[PDB]
Structure formats: structure tokens, C-alpha cells
């Protein structure tokens, strides 16, 4: 079955450089063209570039020529996608894609790339505990002040699944914030401990914050 | 080249039937792609060439068209069909997607649960002050929310995020920050959210008062 991997992304400042990578397996890489999509912030998908089965044959995309370069490694199974000369413009989640004729058949996770020139900057975690009663209660935790995307939150190490909600990021001068929260049994907490959980890959940050009565 | 799809959003209630359209500025003959996205996903190949669908793909989904105008229909939409879909043409280079179509599940209205949160000492600490609201599980998506100090309303430093649509239950939630510096927070005794949703006439409140 196949599978795609790529990785690489990252925060880049602007007139930067950047190279994406993508591990192909489960299937005949060098029989197949490979092709770079990208997904803007405005949720708008923007095809990129793409590699003839060979290599012999790159497209790119007309912003994005003579800035990019687009090649593949046929017995190292990997796809690249060197860029240069970034902009905010060039700011998405970019996914590689293996080809059916002109549909894009198969796709990967994807890798976001940040173009800018604000630092990377951890996040402040703080506790939502309910000011000083109901059979459930409602807590949570507010990231504060990161850069760039992304963070994960998990409730007790993954432990506590039910009740979570994560929302997603909003971006506020260069930082973003985000939230999320989690309902238990009130007979429950703080009888048993909850802790939101925050991993930042960008700063390898990771904190741990209880969640403890006001 | 430029390839335009509409509507722009659609929201269906499961068991009802609809169609998307896609359209190229030039003949593209059948050289015409369709996509889904669901959450935290990465886009799926649903039918490709205009109408030749691909193995695993309910036959729900219906491709159809030829040279400027096709067509992607769905017959009985099920709550998984939720997400984001787009065309994609395979013609003329650059390759290009149309603009795509969010396509949301109605479901039975259901009024939020509201939780409000000062802020911690931790925040205060830094010279910082966020007021934390939290409105889950609503349907529909539409809700007002407002803030108000000592009875004023107000919007200068409050953030608000949806999530997506929930896999499960096709319900929503979104989470609304109002942040201040420490010094402001402390001239003020109560801090409201207040959520105006069509499941009551009355707007919900949910309130915190500095002072106890």
C-alpha cells in the first residue's frame, strides 16, 4: 500500500531558503510522476510543481519558477522540493503527491511551512479552572503566545479522550493562541488530577500543566 | 486558466441529495479531477477524467461533464460526507483546483453549554489578563458572542476560533478570549460572556465578578 511521507518544513525568514523532502514506499517510485501541492492559509489548494517518472520532465508553477526546484532520488525512494527566495506568499502546508495521468491520486500528511520574519517563540500554558455544581466540569488550558504552527495538546498523556475539544490557532501579532478543553465528572476533580499536556516541535518545548481548584 | 466552483458552502440534511459545479474558462474536454478534505486530513482523489470513479468511493458520488462545465453529484448524503471538495483540471498548465465547497451535515439545533474562566495567578504574574469563554456543542454554527466589563460591551483584544465540525455528532464549538493587561482587569468587577444562538430568544450568560 502506498505511503508518503514528507518532512523538512519550518519557520524560514523571508527571502530564505528551505528543503522539503518526501520518503515514497508500497509501490514502483521510479514508474510514477511526482508532484508538490500546496494548501494556503485561505484553505486554497495550489499545485506547485511537478516530476516526470524519470526526473527528465519539471513543471512549476509561474510564481514559483526559477525559485524552486523540483528532484527526485529513484533509488533513495525520496522526492525534493528545494525553494529559495521565500515569501509570505509561499506561507502553506505543502503535500507531495503521486500521479494517476493528471489527477493526484495519492497524498501525504503534509509539512507546513512558515515564511516569516517573527522569532520562534514558546507558549505560555496557562490553567482554566472554574471560579468559585453540576454532574460534569469543565476545564482547560490556554496556549499563549507561540511561533510558528504547530502545537499538540493531549489531556493526561493521552489518557483522557472523551469531553476534549482543541480549537484551532488564531494568529494575533506575530503569536498565535489557542485553547482547549476537556469535561469530567465533577465527582471526579479534583478528587483526580487533570493536566493539559502542550508539545511545541518548533522550540522542542514540551510542558505539563495541572489543572488545580481556584 | 481559471476554474470556478459554487456553491461556495452547502448544508445538508442527511438523506437529501446535492451537486457541485465546476467550471473552466476554456474547454478542458474530460481532463477534470474531484478532491474531498476532511479534518486534519490531507485531500482524497474522489472521482477522476470527469466521471470514471476510483475503487473504494461509494457510488453516492457522481462525476459528469465535458469541456467547460461538470458536475459532482452526491445522492443521500451521509454525516461522513462532511468536509471540503474541489476540482481540479489536468488540461493546460499550470495545473489549477477551483476555489472548493465546504459541505456541512444539518442536524437537530442544539443550544451551547457555556463555561467562563478568569484569569490565572500564573497569567497575572507575566502583567496579563485573558478571560476565557468556552460554547460547546451547538448547533448551527452561527452564534454571536459579546463580552461585557461592568455591563459595556466590548471587542479590542477578544479573540474568537471554531472548531470543525464534530466527526461524531456533527455539532460544533468555539472558544472566545477576551485579554487585557492585569492593571485594566483589576479597575473592573464582573466580566460577562454573553451568547446570542438561535436555540433561545434570550442570550446565555455566564459570568465571573473579580470582587468574589
Known amino acids: 500500500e502506498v505511503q508518503l511521507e514528507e518532512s523538512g518544513g519550518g519557520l524560514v525568514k523571508p527571502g530564505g531558503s528551505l528543503k522539503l523532502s518526501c520518503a515514497a514506499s508500497?509501490?514502483?517510485?521510479?514508474?510514477?510522476?511526482m508532484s508538490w501541492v500546496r494548501q494556503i492559509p485561505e484553505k486554497r489548494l495550489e499545485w506547485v510543481a511537478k516530476?516526470?517518472?524519470?526526473?527528465?520532465?519539471?513543471y512549476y508553477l509561474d510564481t514559483v519558477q526559477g525559485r524552486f526546484t523540483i528532484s527526485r532520488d529513484n533509488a533513495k525512494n525520496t522526492l525534493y522540493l528545494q525553494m529559495s527566495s521565500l515569501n509570505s506568499e509561499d506561507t502553506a502546508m505543502y503535500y507531495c503527491?503521486?500521479?494517476?495521468?493528471?489527477?493526484?491520486?495519492?497524498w501525504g500528511q503534509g509539512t507546513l511551512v512558515t515564511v516569516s520574519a517573527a522569532k520562534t517563540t514558546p507558549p505560555s500554558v496557562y490553567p482554566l479552572a472554574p471560579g468559585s455544581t453540576n454532574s460534569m466540569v469543565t476545564l482547560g488550558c490556554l496556549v499563549k503566545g507561540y511561533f510558528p504552527e504547530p502545537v499538540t495538546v493531549t489531556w493526561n498523556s493521552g489518557s483522557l479522550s472523551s469531553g476534549v475539544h482543541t480549537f484551532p490557532a488564531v494568529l494575533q501579532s506575530d503569536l498565535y493562541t489557542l485553547s482547549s478543553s476537556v469535561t469530567v465528572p465533577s465527582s471526579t476533580w479534583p478528587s483526580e488530577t487533570v493536566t493539559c499536556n502542550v508539545a511545541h516541535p518548533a522550540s522542542s518545548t514540551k510542558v505539563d500543566k495541572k489543572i488545580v481548584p481556584r | 486558466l481559471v476554474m470556478t466552483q459554487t456553491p461556495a458552502t452547502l448544508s445538508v440534511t442527511p438523506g437529501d441529495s446535492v451537486s457541485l459545479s465546476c467550471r473552466a474558462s476554456?474547454?478542458?474536454?474530460?481532463?477534470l479531477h474531484w478532491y474531498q478534505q476532511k479534518s486534519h486530513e490531507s485531500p482524497r482523489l474522489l472521482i477522476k477524467y470527469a466521471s470514471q470513479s476510483i475503487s473504494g468511493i461509494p457510488s453516492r458520488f457522481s462525476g459528469s461533464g465535458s469541456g467547460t462545465d461538470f458536475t459532482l453529484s452526491i445522492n443521500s448524503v451521509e454525516t461522513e460526507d462532511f468536509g471540503m471538495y474541489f476540482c481540479?483540471?489536468?488540461?493546460?498548465?499550470?495545473?489549477?483546483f477551483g476555489g472548493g465547497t465546504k459541505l456541512e451535515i444539518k442536524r437537530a439545533d442544539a443550544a451551547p453549554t457555556v463555561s467562563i474562566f478568569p484569569p490565572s495567578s500564573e497569567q497575572l504574574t507575566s502583567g496579563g489578563a485573558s478571560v476565557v469563554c468556552f460554547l460547546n456543542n451547538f448547533y448551527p454554527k452561527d452564534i454571536n458572542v459579546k463580552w461585557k466589563i461592568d455591563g459595556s460591551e466590548r471587542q479590542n483584544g477578544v479573540l474568537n476560533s471554531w472548531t470543525d465540525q464534530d466527526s461524531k455528532d456533527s455539532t460544533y464549538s468555539m472558544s472566545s478570549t477576551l485579554t487585557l493587561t492585569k492593571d485594566e482587569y483589576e479597575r473592573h468587577n464582573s466580566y460577562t460572556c454573553e451568547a446570542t444562538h438561535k436555540t433561545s430568544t434570550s442570550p446565555i450568560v455566564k459570568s465571573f465578578n473579580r470582587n468574589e
Open positions: 476554456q474547454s478542458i474536454s474530460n481532463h
Open positions: 481540479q483540471q489536468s488540461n493546460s498548465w499550470p495545473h489549477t
Open positions: 503527491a503521486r500521479h494517476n495521468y493528471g489527477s493526484f491520486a495519492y
Open positions: 508500497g509501490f514502483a517510485f521510479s514508474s510514477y510522476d
Open positions: 516530476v516526470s517518472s524519470g526526473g527528465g520532465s519539471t
